[PDB]
Design a protein around this ligand. Structure first.
Ligand code: PKA
Length: 169
């Protein structure tokens, strides 16, 4: 009978499966690919970075607690946000199934997916009822820009600043 919010805890652990198995692809396939193309793979390995969910998890637990504490603890009213968030995030953020497309520049689907999944879902789910929590998450945008910018960098790395001549003589 955990003292902390059982819902927020488990539901917050859910993204741990999609985020773990998700990035698990770049964990090895990424470290290697870097040997071929130029990638910012120099950033601390998922070992030190992956803790992204650890920090956001702490803030999450806090926000959640507030949301439910407002509408009145965890009730049928809290099941709509928490749930709609778990379900929407599951099928929507479920980006690990793109392993097949992870070998293509489309690999960006990861960032775009998880970014809009937790962000969008939390906007209509949590921020919709409790605006204060949204502030505890606010510092999560940096993370969104982290992955998002990552992919953007790769693209411009192998293909950027285009506009030259052809053959001519
Ligand atoms: C490529 C280096 C990755 C492992 N890195 C240091 C990250 O911080 C990171 C963590 C993640 C955690 C969960 C899901 C994705 C990521 C992505 C990432 C960013 C853009 C595209 C694909 C991926 Cl796995 N990147």
């Amino acid at each position: 009978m955990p003292e902390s919010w059982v819902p927020a805890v488990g539901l917050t652990l859910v993204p741990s499966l999609g985020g773990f198995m998700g990035a698990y692809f770049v964990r090895g396939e990424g470290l290697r690919w870097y040997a071929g193309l130029q990638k910012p793979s120099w950033h601390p390995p998922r070992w030190t970075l992956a803790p992204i969910w650890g920090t956001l998890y702490s803030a999450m637990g806090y926000g959640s607690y507030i949301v439910w504490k407002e509408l009145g603890g965890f009730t049928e009213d809290a099941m709509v946000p928490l749930g709609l968030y778990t379900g929407q995030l599951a099928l929507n953020w479920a980006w690990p199934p793109i392993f097949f497309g992870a070998r293509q520049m489309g690999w960006a689907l990861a960032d775009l997916l998880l970014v809009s999944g937790v962000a969008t879902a939390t906007t209509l789910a949590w921020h919709r009822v409790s605006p204060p929590a949204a502030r505890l998450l606010y510092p999560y945008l940096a993370w969104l820009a982290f992955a998002t910018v990552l992919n953007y960098y790769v693209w411009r790395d192998n293909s950027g600043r285009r506009g030259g001549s052809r053959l001519a003589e």
